[PDB]
């Protein structure tokens, strides 16, 4: 109980900021996550011995892919930590417990391929889960790891609290399916504007938690330019591999995923910032005012991408 994790001074200060980069030392990421849980939740939330065992199984079930990896898991959980810390009073005890675990687990056992490629490949997972294929797999993997012996970090919860937290986790992981984001943002938009957005309505909470999950999942677009730019390379290394695999099934891939069309990537980033990122953080800022720094950082990176096209870098 009296065993606080502390970070070196630069990390202690910068981890509070939305734009924090968890760094290149993998050995520090578990401790960074524990520190975030202890400050976001309490030193009481989780029995440390169980949490540390949970974290190491979770790490072991992420794959060595360019982007959808362990570092992404912890980066997404750090964004959730920043939102939750800048919106202290708005979230329940159980939500704070659940959402950092959801974010750490949201891409469990990802192979670096989209739901579309599983469907065209005819992967067993596409037969088992017709929509949000990889996301239902991520939640399935989460439940499996929680049910390993010595891994149930939720044991001190009641039967009802247990079901509520796993329901929070399930909706949260499903919501990272970007196919679901568009409808979810549109409905949050209409609720906020007409003024009917009511945070005591559990269905309205679900929607808001989903937008947060999208915001955290995309947060590589909200980092300082050199981080955002270098993460773009890992992101497109998975897209191009998926494009290669599409051509192998005799399907010309969308240009995004075609490694012959690398010249079209900067224009593709504009589309993505304009169509997905800018609206995502706009709507989130309107619902949760203290997350504005995500919108600001997102807008700055859009400006950096327009500069790449103009030729000035
Ligand atoms: C097509 N596309 C999808 N599905 N996710 C992303 C993305 C996610 C984080 C950062 N940059 C990104 C650029 C393009 C993306
Ligand atoms: Mg995912
Ligand atoms: Zn993700």
Curated annotation (Swiss-Prot):
GO terms for molecular function: 3',5'-cGMP-stimulated cyclic-nucleotide phosphodiesterase activity; 3',5'-cyclic-AMP phosphodiesterase activity; 3',5'-cyclic-GMP phosphodiesterase activity; 3',5'-cyclic-nucleotide phosphodiesterase activity; cAMP binding; cGMP binding; metal ion binding. Abundant in the putamen and caudate nucleus regions of brain and testis, moderately expressed in the thyroid gland, pituitary gland, thalamus and cerebellum. Its main location: cytoplasm. Residues 1-312 form the PDEase domain. The keyword Iron-sulfur does not apply. GO terms for biological process: cAMP catabolic process; cAMP-mediated signaling; cGMP catabolic process; negative regulation of cGMP-mediated signaling; regulation of adenylate cyclase-activating G protein-coupled receptor signaling pathway; regulation of cAMP/PKA signal transduction. A divalent metal cation 1 binds at residues 72, 106-107, 217. One of its GO terms (cellular component) is glutamatergic synapse. 3',5'-cyclic GMP binds at residues 68, 269. The keyword Acyltransferase does not apply. The active site is at 68 (proton donor). 3',5'-cyclic AMP binds at residues 68, 269. Keywords: Allosteric enzyme, cAMP, cAMP-binding, cGMP, cGMP-binding, Cytoplasm, Disease variant, Hydrolase, Metal-binding, Nucleotide-binding, Phosphoprotein, Repeat. Changing residue 107 to A: Loss of activity and of zinc binding. It is found in: Cytoplasm, Cytosol. A divalent metal cation 2 binds at residue 107. The tandem GAF domains bind cAMP, and regulate enzyme activity. The binding of cAMP stimulates enzyme activity. It is linked to Dyskinesia, limb and orofacial, infantile-onset: An autosomal recessive, early-onset hyperkinetic movement disorder characterized by axial hypotonia, dyskinesia of the limbs and trunk, orofacial dyskinesia, drooling, and dysarthria. The severity of the hyperkinesis is variable. Striatal degeneration, autosomal dominant 2: An autosomal dominant disorder characterized by striatal degeneration and dysfunction of basal ganglia, resulting in hyperkinesis. Homodimer. Belongs to the cyclic nucleotide phosphodiesterase family. Plays a role in signal transduction by regulating the intracellular concentration of cyclic nucleotides. Can hydrolyze both cAMP and cGMP, but has higher affinity for cAMP and is more efficient with cAMP as substrate. May play a critical role in regulating cAMP and cGMP levels in the striatum, a region of the brain that contributes to the control of movement and cognition. This is cAMP and cAMP-inhibited cGMP 3',5'-cyclic phosphodiesterase 10A. It comes from Homo sapiens. The gene is PDE10A.
């Amino acid at each position: 109980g009296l065993m606080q994790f502390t970070l070196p001074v630069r990390l202690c200060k910068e981890i509070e900021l939305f734009h924090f980069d968890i760094g290149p030392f993998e050995n520090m990421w578990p401790g960074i996550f524990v520190y975030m849980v202890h400050r976001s939740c309490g030193t009481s939330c989780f029995e440390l011995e169980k949490l540390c065992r949970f974290i190491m199984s979770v790490k072991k079930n992420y794959r060595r892919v360019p982007y959808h990896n362990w570092k992404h898991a912890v980066t997404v959980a750090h964004c959730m930590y920043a939102i939750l810390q800048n919106n202290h009073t708005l979230f329940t005890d159980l939500e704070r417990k659940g959402l950092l675990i959801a974010c750490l687990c949201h891409d469990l056992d990802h192979r670096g391929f989209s739901n579309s490629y599983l469907q065209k490949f005819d992967h067993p997972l596409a037969a088992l889960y017709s929509t949000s294929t990889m996301e239902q797999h991520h939640f399935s993997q989460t439940v499996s790891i929680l049910q390993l012996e010595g891994h149930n970090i939720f044991s001190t919860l009641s039967s009802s609290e247990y079901e509520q937290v796993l329901e929070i986790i399930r909706k949260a992981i499903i919501a990272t399916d970007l196919a679901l984001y568009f409808g979810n943002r549109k409905q949050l938009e209409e609720m906020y504007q007409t003024g009917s957005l009511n945070l005591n309505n559990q269905s309205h909470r679900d929607r808001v938690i989903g937008l947060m999950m999208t915001a955290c999942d995309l947060c590589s677009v909200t980092k300082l330019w050199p981080v955002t730019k270098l993460t773009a390379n890992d992101i497109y290394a998975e897209f191009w591999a998926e494009g290669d695999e599409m051509k192998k099934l005799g399907i010309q891939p969308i240009p995004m995923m075609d490694r012959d069309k690398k010249d079209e990537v900067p224009q593709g980033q504009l589309g993505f910032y304009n169509a997905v990122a800018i609206p995502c953080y706009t709507t989130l800022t309107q619902i949760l005012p203290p997350t504005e720094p995500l919108l600001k950082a997102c807008r700055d990176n859009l400006s950096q991408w327009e500069k790449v096209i103009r030729g000035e870098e």
